[PDB]
Design a protein around this ligand. Structure first.
Ligand SMILES: NC(=O)c1ccc[n+]([C@@H]2O[C@H](COP(=O)([O-])OP(=O)(O)OC[C@H]3O[C@@H](n4cnc5c(N)ncnc54)[C@H](O)[C@@H]3O)[C@@H](O)[C@H]2O)c1
Lengths: 442, 341, 49, 142, 208, 97, 175, 47, 93
RNA sequence: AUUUUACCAAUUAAGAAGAAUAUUAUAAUAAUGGGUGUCUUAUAUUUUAAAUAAAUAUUUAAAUUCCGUGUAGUAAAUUUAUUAUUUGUAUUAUUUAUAUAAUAGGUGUAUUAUAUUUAAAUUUUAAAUUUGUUGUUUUAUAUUUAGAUACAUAUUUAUAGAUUAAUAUAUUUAAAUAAUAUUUUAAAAUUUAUUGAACUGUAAUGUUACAGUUGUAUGUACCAAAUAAAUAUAGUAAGAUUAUUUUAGUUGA
RNA sequence: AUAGGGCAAGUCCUACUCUCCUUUACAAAGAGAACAUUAUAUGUAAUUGUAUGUUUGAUUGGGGCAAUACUAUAUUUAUUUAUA
């Protein structure tokens, strides 16, 4: 009810049976008494380390800007970042170093985390943008169909004259006023809305959510997420060994499979993907935080038989990382391959965001060593990207004797001479007196 | 319309009028340790006399202030029991009056007795002890004991830093700007400001004590002492402001939604309280005796049942049909193996 | 006073609700008269005659 | 309605996605001819010629010096009415500035800039605005 | 409600009829200056989008445009100093908005430019060429990827030839051709040949 | 409807006009007209300044500039185009004239 | 439109027959009753009650020989601030006290003098300093305050005005 | 606002000061004619 | 670009009203927003839950997901009380 | 011997599969008119025609014109495709029934004005209509239910003038590129297609023939007929329109 | 008997309009005759019908504007215009 309404207190007795239970009801001894659940802050989810333990070196105290390591401690073989780190606006300006676990639940080494990804301080407005987009997008628009006056299936004829009978003037009573009738403007799937998300906002919100998980200490870096066998018993055994609570009421785990440090992959590991199909709350997501630029070909009602909501026709796939899933699942697990892919796909965006007086310095400090120009040995890439690059290298040979050489286009663009034919009203190329231009067909 | 207030007007109730409970020093600490590191009486009339004495103090009529404080102290001594807050406070005022008049020895004796009474008492007021330390420092400075006055000021500073809450003053005054619903006019409510110097007298007392300590250091010629005391004063003001800070909600005019006032004015935690008792540093005690779901290793500490048996994982598809159920026969066995031991 | 002088050309300066009741009564009377007239013209029974 | 109704038991009709209106439907040629908008974005006014818009007999008006060519702003009431007719396209979005009386380069090019049109090479960069392409040496229509 | 502001959904509808009227949803005295109206964008009209010389100089200073190369609309688009919204035919016109000097020579190829901007460029020592183009030429310049061979470029229309392409003041790129005489002298000399003034395989071999 | 107001005394109940110290509608119109006329006369106390070309409204500035364009490009004093849209003659001498 | 549906259905049990049986009739009757009671309370109840009190006081005055008119005027003249409710209560439960009040009003006892205006003591005009001590005006004000303190009640501070005024010397310490 | 307030004050003063005007026959206000003070048949005592 | 409407979230299915949005999904015609509210005075059923909007993680016999209440299925054994303990459907006396 | 005044009171816990191979949308793979209690006989069981149609189209320019009724190949057989009882109750969401009934043996008064018990006082519909604001007008037995749509908000990749009738000119400051919607009930309506002569009105000798730009007052118990389809300038008819405890300007210009 | 149970209605005079009638004019049918080209048509179609829709808002008027500026000269003038 409303606090100010009299109904809020119109009941004055009978709420409690004055006789207490003999099982758990107790008394308040005094301030020295520690009451369960009591806490000075309004915690709607009053959890502690025992309920939902955090996987991080330190409990996230306000004294620490983040629970993870701030320096590369010498006890472990610290690994740097795949790409150089530049602190953009919104980054924590602090060094993020986290320990990497193995399938045995024991740390093997430590890894640097990019501030632009796990160091972008969260903001509630952006997180809420992401959450609202996901909530609106994850509805079953096909089930939002309702009948209409023209669909009620009643005779199209005045049921009786205006004044002759003695009842209200009603003709063709298909209207909402009647129980069998419909609505003038009912809800239809093609009338509903599917919001259009921007790649920039989506990436920013996803990185803010990742940083929020990192701050809360729910983040865990794992070397590999492979199973001995593709069954579910092996997956449950791995969860038990790693102390992952995938029960429906345990906290949940989100998995960015990706790949290992040496062999990042965009495709889920076969065995783990097969074995991760378990009833309990446990979600598997792609190793990407970006999203394909959403579009809407039917931006106007040009296709009248479009049985889909107005708006973007390319909504984010369900398995994509999102704020809703990140909040619902307690722990987050990210593989070295996932980190590699995230850094690889966000490096260009970070550099473009950087201002110009730092952009110009980038190459000076060596953050723009392009493998294509031979400045450096080619960088590490996922299995699929490396295969595609090898295919390109192998196929580059055939573009040698043809004028349409993509690698060396317009080779004779300088030695040729350009002439203007007034009679033809055109401009043409000539090499050694031979017309090289092409009279475009029409 | 416009109001002239030519006739009596009842002051409007506002959240800034909350009766703030004064900070009190803990019962397990000793002011002496820190240093060494009812009969009927017309209290209304004696309060009139005390107010008149305060006015004389402000007006510079120190002899008259001392004369009034003499009667007030006599009355309080007769009325209240020994080692009482009112008695020590009136003795502080009397010591200040003596110091201003010129009876430095009398002022020193009175403030020393005040400190003795504070040590003897239990849970003394933080503001009261800070004011007593300030008065002792001023008296020592007047006597010429600059070093001891500075020591007293520093002691007051450390006492307030270690036993003062810097956000409690504006706990209920921090979300007031959110009450405002109009932007074109009556927008002073969206920027309503309450001065910490007025809503936290301990802060003002310590600020004055640190200013006097800085002046004494400058007079002596010391540099490190002045730097540290000024920096501590700056940090104190920074703490107060930080506790006062907040973002802006709705900016432009809002029509209706007057029931949002309940949300706007609440026990909103202050920044200092939030940082102190964050959910992780100040963990929540969760007794599984009164809870159903418990961690994997402590599955046996759940709310006891008369005689309970596990049926399945509650798979909603079980209701559907033979094939749907057949597609989940081993789920319960696998879950049991997962939760084994 | 008239009902809506701006719409007198449409509703005769009388509320349609009052006009609705008046026309209901008059139409009841007219329907009864028409049924009687049909019976008279067809031989005491409208459908049958 | 209720489940046990023949009205919904039988299938009368089904409605499609209702077609939308032309985006520049309320940009009227009468305005585009009579008036023209000019001035700063937040202080722009619509102006029209000033004079006697009437046809006399042959010998009535003789001194052309009386008739002079000049522009004067239309009445603010009519300007507000026309700007409203331009605004009504998108009413929820208060941030969207009113549509211009005459289309400009940015407005013409935004549609082609969109992704779906970004792929359409035949409609990009003022294809219709540009003059016609030269036809082929031999061209027949039969 | 129109005459009463925001009213609660509860009731009090009796005093509101304009609200329902709006829910259910002088030019005649002014003359027509022309058949198409004032500022009519008839087909073939040269309506250039502005390109602030100050904006171009700012881009150069920041570093999005390389001074060492002859700037073109394609280079501007790739550097992202202009958006696709403002690329309509005929293209851009250079305007010297608030610019008094150009410290360094700049070589640009736009579809039009102001006299002041051309003077500033020439005084600074750079060069400007009014490369007036048709739709095909503009599209080819913006998307050279799609044309592996130099497709025959049709010359602009008569309006373009008169105004921009063959205008010495605008530095029209066809001024030399228009001024030539042999093309009028004989069909053989109708066209005069012009020439520029005088690998790319990303994979390399690792060497230690 | 009538704007109801929270009362502070029965005098507000007896009150009919919310602002008794405010002139009625006709007197408001009279006072506003007098104030506007006085302000206009104060503005026009000085003569009609002949503003330059650049200061003309948007619908005269460009016409004047186009009319005098040739003289701007070929500089010689004594060139004035007698345009029609320019400011009208006041009829009396002024300080700015 | 809001009506006190839930609030009034609760007390709908206080009506009879059709109103108590049918929700709509009972709610309408209760709404009407509440509105009429509100109007009566805000515009006639006080008048009726104070008229009754007036009549009771008048009857007491008549029994004692006076009447409400003269009694009210003489109470005003004598400055006895007894509200009419208090006068009725005294007449009904303390007839002797009411008769004493009537006798006071009847008697030619001089009514209390009007309140005095603040008087500036000659000490304010006395120069200070003449050409460690206290201003004579301040000393006089302190003496008046101490006298008020002592006269407010039988406090144990003592009746010695001079001793109280010399209190600060008790806390003073001789150098 | 200053001009409007001044005009309102002037209007109030003009409409509230000249309560009554001398009869036009005795002296025409519109013709600038004014009537002086005739104290012949007057008295000095405070009656 | 435009933030996704917060009313389009499936957190509320209000009864059709005078004020709304073309994309605001209101309750169907002839249907009530709150399932248990057959009458304005009806009480919320105790221990009976009607899962709505998603497939439940854990479904009890006493609850409803997409069927109606029948004693022989919702209450197999009356003397037994089902509940969720340690993420399992556990039944006690 | 005889006998207990008159009047006044109230709705709630539900006994049992008397609710599911259910209701709606959803499948882009079938398809010669589905017809069981059917069950020879084919002179007698034939529907075809270059057109906006069970095939349904990504933008604001210019442009005919007395309210501009308006936008092109995007890939060339390229995956926007008219789907479909189960190899998941198909999946996902959504919706859902009024069969059923001890309830009390007397708180207020007893010569008449209306709930709160100290006696009194107060009290005697609501909504819309009526702008000459009513005593005009219309609706409401009651219980429960059904019943009506203008997005209250734009975080780094990012870049946005004008101006002439026209040529032309362009000395010279912004910006969160987003579109799809727009109460509800009701017009004497008109339009398309179709049937009716068992009533009635004629001709023929009960039956036959003639029918809605129409046959002979009427054409099957409302003749501007009947049946089927439709949401016309619903506007310059009218009615209805779901969210109390509120927080700022003018009351006849 | 009163209220309820549809009712600004009745007569009378004036004014305007509708229905209706008619023809020589207006629009407009359909149909047809005739004509051009060589028993079926195409292209025009001034007759007729008048079935049908109209047939008392005239500011789509009147006035005022009248090359020969500027400095200057001469003539004439219905008693101060006129012309170069
Ligand atoms: N014609 C246009 O309007 C137009 C428009 C945009 C782009 N282009 C590009 O111009 C070039 C020629 O166009 P056109 O109209 O003069 O001839 P065209 O488009 O009719 O091509 C005809 C033949 O050329 C082949 N061809 C085209 N590109 C080829 C390539 N890289 N390598 C090998 N074969 C190729 C085609 O397979 C086809 O068989 C094309 O590459 C096209 O992408 C042309």
């Amino acid at each position: 009810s409303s606090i100010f309404s009299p109904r809020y207190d119109w009941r004055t007795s009978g709420v409690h049976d004055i006789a207490p239970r003999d099982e758990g009801d107790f008394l308040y001894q005094g301030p020295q008494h520690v009451l369960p659940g009591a806490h000075p802050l309004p915690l709607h989810h009053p959890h502690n380390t025992i309920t939902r333990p955090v996987i991080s070196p330190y409990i996230p105290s306000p004294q620490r800007s983040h629970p993870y390591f701030t320096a590369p401690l010498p006890e472990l073989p610290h690994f740097s970042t795949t790409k150089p780190i530049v602190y953009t606006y919104g980054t924590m300006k602090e060094r993020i170093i986290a320990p990497v676990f193995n399938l045995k639940n024991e740390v093997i080494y430590t890894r640097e985390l990019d501030p632009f990804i796990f160091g972008m301080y969260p903001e509630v407005e952006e997180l809420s943008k992401n959450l609202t987009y996901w909530m609106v997008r994850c509805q079953n628009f096909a089930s939002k169909w309702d009948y209409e006056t023209r669909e009620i299936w009643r005779k199209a004829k005045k049921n009786w004259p205006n004044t002759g009978m003695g009842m209200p003037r009603v003709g063709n009573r298909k209207n909402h006023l009647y129980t069998w009738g419909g609505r003038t403007k009912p809800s239809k799937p093609w009338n509903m809305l599917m919001p259009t998300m921007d790649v920039k906002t989506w990436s920013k919100s996803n990185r803010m959510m990742l940083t929020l998980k990192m701050l809360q200490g729910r983040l865990q870096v794992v070397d590999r997420l492979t199973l001995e066998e593709p069954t579910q018993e092996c997956y449950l055994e791995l969860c038990r060994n790693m102390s992952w609570d995938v029960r429906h009421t345990g906290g949940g785990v989100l998995f960015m499979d990706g790949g290992s440090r040496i062999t990042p992959s965009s495709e889920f590991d076969r065995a783990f993907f097969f074995g991760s199909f378990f009833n309990g709350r446990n979600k598997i997501v792609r190793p990407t935080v970006l999203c394909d630029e959403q579009y809407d070909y039917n931006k106007t009602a040009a296709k009248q038989r479009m049985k889909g909501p107005k708006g973007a026709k390319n909504p984010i796939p369900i398995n994509r990382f999102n704020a809703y899933d990140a909040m619902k699942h307690d722990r987050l697990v990210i593989t070295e391959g996932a980190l590699m892919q995230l850094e690889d796909e966000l490096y260009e965006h970070k550099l473009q965001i950087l201002p110009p007086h730092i952009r110009n310095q980038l190459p000076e400090y060596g953050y723009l060593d392009s493998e294509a120009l031979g400045d450096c040995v080619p960088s590490l890439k996922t299995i699929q990207m490396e295969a595609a690059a090898r295919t390109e290298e192998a196929e580059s040979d055939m573009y040698k004797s043809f004028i349409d050489n993509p690698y060396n286009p317009w080779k004779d663009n300088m030695d040729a001479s350009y002439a203007v034919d007034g009679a033809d009203g055109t401009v043409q190329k000539f090499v050694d007196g031979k017309k090289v231009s092409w009279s475009m067909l029409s | 319309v416009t109001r002239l207030y030519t006739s009596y007007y009842t002051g409007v109730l506002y959240p800034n009028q909350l009766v703030q409970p004064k900070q009190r020093l803990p019962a397990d600490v000793s002011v002496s340790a820190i240093l060494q590191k009812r009969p009927y009486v017309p209290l209304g009339e004696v309060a009139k006399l005390e107010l008149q004495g305060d006015y004389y103090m402000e007006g510079g009529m120190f002899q008259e202030a001392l004369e009034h404080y003499g009667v007030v102290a006599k009355a309080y001594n007769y009325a209240y029991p020994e080692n009482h807050a009112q008695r020590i406070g009136i003795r502080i005022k009397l010591s200040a009056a003596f110091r201003q008049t010129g009876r430095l020895e009398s002022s020193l004796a009175n403030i020393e007795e005040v400190l003795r009474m504070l040590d003897a008492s239990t849970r003394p007021s933080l503001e009261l002890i800070c004011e007593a330390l300030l008065e002792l420092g001023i008296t020592r400075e007047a006597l010429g004991m600059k070093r001891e006055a500075t020591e007293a000021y520093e002691e007051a500073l450390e006492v307030v830093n270690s036993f003062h809450n810097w956000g409690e003053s504006h706990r209920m005054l921090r979300l007031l700007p959110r009450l405002g619903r109009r932007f074109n006019y009556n927008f002073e409510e969206k920027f309503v400001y309450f001065s910490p110097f007025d809503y936290d007298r301990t802060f003002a007392l310590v600020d004055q004590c640190l200013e006097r300590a800085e002046t004494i250091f400058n007079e002596i010629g010391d540099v490190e002492g002045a730097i540290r005391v000024l920096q501590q004063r700056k940090e104190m003001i920074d703490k107060k402001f930080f506790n006062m800070r907040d973002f802006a909600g709705r900016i432009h005019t809002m029509r209706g939604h007057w029931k949002r006032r309940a949300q706007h004015l609440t026990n909103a935690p202050t920044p200092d309280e939030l940082l102190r008792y964050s959910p992780t540093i100040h963990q929540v005690h969760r007794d599984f005796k009164y809870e159903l779901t418990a961690p994997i290793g402590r599955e046996k500490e759940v709310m006891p049942g008369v005689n309970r048996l596990v049926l399945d994982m509650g798979n909603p598809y079980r209701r559907r049909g033979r094939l749907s159920n057949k597609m989940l026969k081993d789920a319960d066995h696998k879950f049991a193996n997962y939760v084994r031991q | 006073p008239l009902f809506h002088p701006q719409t007198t050309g449409v509703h005769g300066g009388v509320p349609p609700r009052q006009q609705q009741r008046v026309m209901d009564a008059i139409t009841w009377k007219a329907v009864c008269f028409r049924r009687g007239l049909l019976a008279r013209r067809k031989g005491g029974r409208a459908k049958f005659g | 309605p209720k489940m046990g109704c023949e009205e919904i038991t039988r299938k009368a009709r089904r409605v499609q996605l209702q077609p939308t209106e032309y985006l520049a439907q309320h940009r009227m040629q009468v305005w585009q001819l009579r008036f023209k908008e000019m001035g700063p974005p937040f202080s722009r006014v619509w102006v029209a010629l000033g004079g006697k818009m009437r046809r006399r007999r042959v010998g009535r008006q003789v001194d052309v010096k009386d008739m002079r060519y000049y522009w004067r702003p239309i009445e603010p009431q009519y300007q507000r009415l026309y700007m409203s007719r331009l605004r009504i396209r998108d009413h929820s979005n208060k941030l969207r500035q009113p549509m211009r009386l005459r289309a400009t380069n940015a407005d013409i090019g935004s549609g082609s800039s969109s992704i779906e049109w970004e792929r359409a090479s035949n409609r990009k960069y003022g294809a219709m605005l540009a003059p016609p392409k030269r036809q082929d040496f031999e061209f027949r229509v039969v | 409600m129109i005459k009463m502001g925001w009213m609660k959904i509860g009731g009090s509808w009796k005093y509101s009829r304009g609200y329902n009227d709006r829910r259910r949803v002088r030019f005649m005295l002014a003359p027509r200056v022309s058949a198409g109206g004032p500022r009519n964008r008839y087909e073939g009209k040269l309506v250039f989008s502005p390109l602030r010389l100050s904006k171009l100089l700012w881009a150069i200073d920041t570093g999005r445009i390389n001074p060492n190369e002859v700037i073109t609309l394609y280079h501007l688009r790739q550097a992202n100093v202009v958006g696709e919204r403002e690329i309509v035919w005929p293209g851009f016109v250079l305007i010297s908005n608030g610019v008094r000097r150009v410290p360094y020579p700049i070589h640009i190829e736009l579809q039009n430019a102001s006299a002041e901007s051309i003077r500033l460029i020439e005084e600074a020592g750079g060069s400007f060429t009014c490369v007036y183009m048709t739709h095909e030429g503009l599209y080819q310049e913006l998307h050279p990827e799609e044309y592996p061979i130099f497709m025959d470029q049709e010359l602009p229309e008569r309006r373009g030839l008169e105004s921009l392409a063959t205008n010495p003041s605008k530095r029209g790129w066809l001024t030399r051709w228009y001024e030539d005489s042999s093309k009028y002298a004989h069909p053989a000399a109708g066209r005069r040949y012009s020439h520029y003034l005088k690998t790319l395989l990303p994979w390399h071999s690792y060497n230690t | 409807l009538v704007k109801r107001h929270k009362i502070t005394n029965n005098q507000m109940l007896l009150m009919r006009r919310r602002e008794p110290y405010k002139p009625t509608m006709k007197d408001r119109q009279e006072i506003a007209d007098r104030a506007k006329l006085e302000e206009f006369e104060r503005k026009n106390a000085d003569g009609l300044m002949f503003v330059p070309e650049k200061a003309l409204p948007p619908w005269q500035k460009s016409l004047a500039h186009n009319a005098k364009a040739l003289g701007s490009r070929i500089n010689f004093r004594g060139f004035r185009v007698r345009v029609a849209d320019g400011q009208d003659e006041p009829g009396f001498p002024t300080p700015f004239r | 439109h809001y009506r006190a549906k839930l609030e009034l259905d609760r007390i709908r049990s206080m009506l009879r027959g059709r109103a108590r049986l049918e929700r709509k009739v009972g709610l309408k009757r209760l709404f009407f009753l509440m509105r009429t009671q509100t109007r009566y309370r805000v515009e006639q109840q006080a008048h009726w009650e104070r008229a009754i009190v007036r009549k009771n006081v008048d009857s007491a005055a008549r029994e004692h020989g006076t009447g409400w008119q003269h009694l009210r005027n003489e109470l005003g003249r004598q400055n006895v601030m007894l509200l009419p409710r208090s006068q009725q209560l005294l007449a009904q439960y303390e007839p002797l006290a009411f008769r004493a009040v009537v006798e006071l009003c009847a008697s030619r006892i001089p009514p209390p003098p009007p309140p005095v205006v603040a008087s500036v003591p000659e000490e304010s005009y006395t120069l200070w300093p003449p050409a460690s001590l206290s201003h004579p005006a301040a000393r006089v004000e302190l003496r008046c305050g101490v006298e008020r303190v002592l006269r407010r009640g039988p406090s144990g501070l003592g009746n010695n005005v001079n001793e109280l005024i010399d209190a600060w010397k008790e806390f003073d310490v001789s150098p | 606002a200053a001009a409007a307030a001044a005009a309102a004050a002037a209007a109030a003063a003009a409409a509230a000061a000249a309560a009554a005007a001398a009869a036009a026959a005795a002296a025409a206000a519109a013709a600038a004619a004014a009537a002086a003070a005739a104290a012949a048949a007057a008295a000095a005592a405070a009656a | 670009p435009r933030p996704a409407p917060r009313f389009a979230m499936g957190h509320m299915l209000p009864h059709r009203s005078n004020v709304g949005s073309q994309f605001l999904h209101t309750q169907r015609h002839g249907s009530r927003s709150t399932w248990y509210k057959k009458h304005y005075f009806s009480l919320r059923p105790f221990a009976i839950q009607r899962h709505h909007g998603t497939t439940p993680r854990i479904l009890l016999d006493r609850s409803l997901w997409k069927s109606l209440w029948i004693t022989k299925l919702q209450l197999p054994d009356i003397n037994r009380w089902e509940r969720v303990v340690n993420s399992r459907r556990v039944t006690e006396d």
